[PDB]
Write a protein that binds this ligand. Structure first.
Ligand code: NA
Length: 287
């Protein structure tokens, strides 16, 4: 079933109503995904769901810039992570009853007014959210609706996975991959067989294909699996103690212990889309 309210859309799986996803129209932000009653995403207890600022948790959408840009004339004018996550998307309706599937849209005319003036590029976004019995798929299509100008952008899904304890968690299937370390400001190959956590980390793994599933493991159990299509980068982020303290809408301050962000995207460089042309990708979350 699908249920629309003024602020959100909620999908429940027809075989089991305790499997659900809640999507805020603001940012088209998934902020809860329950699998048979069990919450799969981390959301700050102080997250704003009222459209006052981006949602701290769930799956914020990152477009058209990942991070803060300094050198592009127009992208450098935008705040960190762009304008998709602070614009109210239009619910386009349901496309399927089983698996329950819905679409959301954004275009300059309905996007964040201040930010649209800073970056007045033509585009159309369509987000498709599909709720399976044992997975969540979030797919994106971007269309360059200009007839003359190329459209230059990054795309990233800022997925916050919920875990029990970051220090006892590991992430597998990234051994031997190249990364850019945003904290150290250097690139290197990750030579370790798994990723483990003891401090702030902010790394961008590269060359991750549709064939390379990433697993999050706790007490020997794969508690989360992430697959993707057409998103060659993966950001791995945890704020740790100090950064968490500084984030006003991040609570509890120990909350970094129950989250890990593993964020598929195209962020190592910009996609340049010719006029009239389309680009598409998705991420797929399961257990
Ligand atoms: Na606070």
């Amino acid at each position: 079933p699908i249920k629309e309210t003024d602020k959100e859309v909620v999908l429940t799986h027809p075989a089991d109503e305790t499997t659900s996803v809640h999507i805020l129209k603001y940012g088209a932000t998934v902020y809860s995904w329950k699998l048979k009653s069990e919450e799969q995403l981390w959301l700050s207890t102080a997250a704003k769901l009222d459209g006052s600022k981006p949602v701290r948790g769930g799956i914020p959408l990152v477009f058209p810039v990942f991070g803060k840009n300094s050198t592009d004339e127009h992208l450098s004018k935008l705040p960190q992570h762009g304008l998709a996550r602070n614009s109210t998307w239009e619910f386009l309706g349901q496309t399927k009853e089983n698996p329950p599937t819905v679409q959301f849209g954004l275009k300059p005319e309905i996007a964040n007014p201040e930010l649209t003036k800073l970056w007045p590029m033509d585009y159309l976004l369509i987000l498709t959210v599909e709720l399976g019995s044992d997975y969540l798929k979030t797919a994106i299509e971007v269309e360059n609706t200009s007839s003359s100008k190329e459209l230059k952008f990054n795309w990233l899904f800022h997925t916050y996975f919920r875990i029990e304890d970051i220090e006892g968690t590991m992430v597998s299937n990234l051994a031997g991959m190249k990364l850019y370390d945003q904290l150290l400001k250097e690139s290197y190959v990750d030579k370790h067989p798994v990723v483990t956590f003891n401090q702030e980390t902010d790394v961008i793994y590269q060359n991750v294909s549709a064939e390379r599933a990433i697993q999050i493991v706790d007490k020997g159990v794969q508690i989360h699996t992430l697959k993707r299509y057409n998103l060659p980068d993966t950001v791995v982020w945890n704020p740790w103690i100090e950064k968490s303290q500084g984030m006003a809408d991040f609570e509890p301050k120990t909350g970094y212990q129950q989250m890990i962000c593993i964020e598929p995207g195209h962020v190592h460089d910009f996609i340049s889309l010719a006029p009239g042309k389309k680009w598409n990708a998705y991420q797929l979350l399961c257990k």
